[PDB]
Design a protein around this ligand. Sequence first.
Ligand SMILES: C[C@H]1Oc2cc(cnc2N)-c2c(nn(C)c2C#N)CN(C)C(=O)c2ccc(F)cc21
Length: 295
Amino acid sequence: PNYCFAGKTSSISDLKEVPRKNITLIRGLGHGAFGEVYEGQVSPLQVAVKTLPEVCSEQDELDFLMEALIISKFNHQNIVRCIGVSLQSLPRFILMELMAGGDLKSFLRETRPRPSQPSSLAMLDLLHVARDIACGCQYLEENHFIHRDIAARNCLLTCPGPGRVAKIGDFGMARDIYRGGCAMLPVKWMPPEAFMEGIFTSKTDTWSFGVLLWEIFSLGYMPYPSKSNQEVLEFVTSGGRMDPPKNCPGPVYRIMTQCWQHQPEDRPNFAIILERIEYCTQDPDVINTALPIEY
Ligand SMILES: C[C@H]1Oc2cc(cnc2N)-c2c(nn(C)c2C#N)CN(C)C(=O)c2ccc(F)cc21
């Protein structure tokens, strides 16, 4: 089974097989419903290890291989690196760049300004995260790769503290399409034409990035508070959009509303999104805006 990205075709042969003896698991990182994730080290190189359960179907096996090929073929600083794989021993491993800041949704929720830590985050921190992910998205766009699932839960941070870099860290939806059910669709992140006609383009990711921006500036809230998937589907198709997050500067909210234009042609590409984020970061009135302190 081959994988095609950009101009090139790659195969399982192209993956970097790391000798299993060189790999040591250290601790769990919060395992999902299928496959575990560990902190590990390679002989030392610090890594995250994604595992394939040994009790799995052949389709699961092909899914795991395809994920390894997809991530291994990306080359961008805002996309998590694949250090290698261990596919010749069981359970099979994919080895990733260790993003010690964890996923972005959890980071935002856990790092909200509080009376004890009133200065944990500032507007600039959020703008830098937004810029980081938009840079990753621009790389995907210019290489004609549609992510399909841009959302805070699928982004990672290099570290919790000040020098953090945000990166896109999961490509499971894209993998599935390359190779499911309504209840599992990221409805709240999808544009009208996506869930209606099943049409996908890079402007699909623009819409989702708008929702990510809302997640970021809301400090990790679930989009469309109190609305179910179907309610959001009908709301969005009717022209409904989310209100600004609490204390969100107008220039930032306007990037969101542009990302959520009904017509894909009316939505900005990621080059433009990056330009607008950069302008926001220059504006003193934006970056001097205080985030809410949760009590
Ligand atoms: C496949 C997995 O990858 C990594 C996870 C972590 C770090 N680095 C990588 N590469 C991580 C997480 N939490 N913490 C505390 C750490 C640490 N250190 C998040 N997590 C448990 C995930 O499963 C997850 C979530 C989203 C996503 F995009 C990829 C992943």
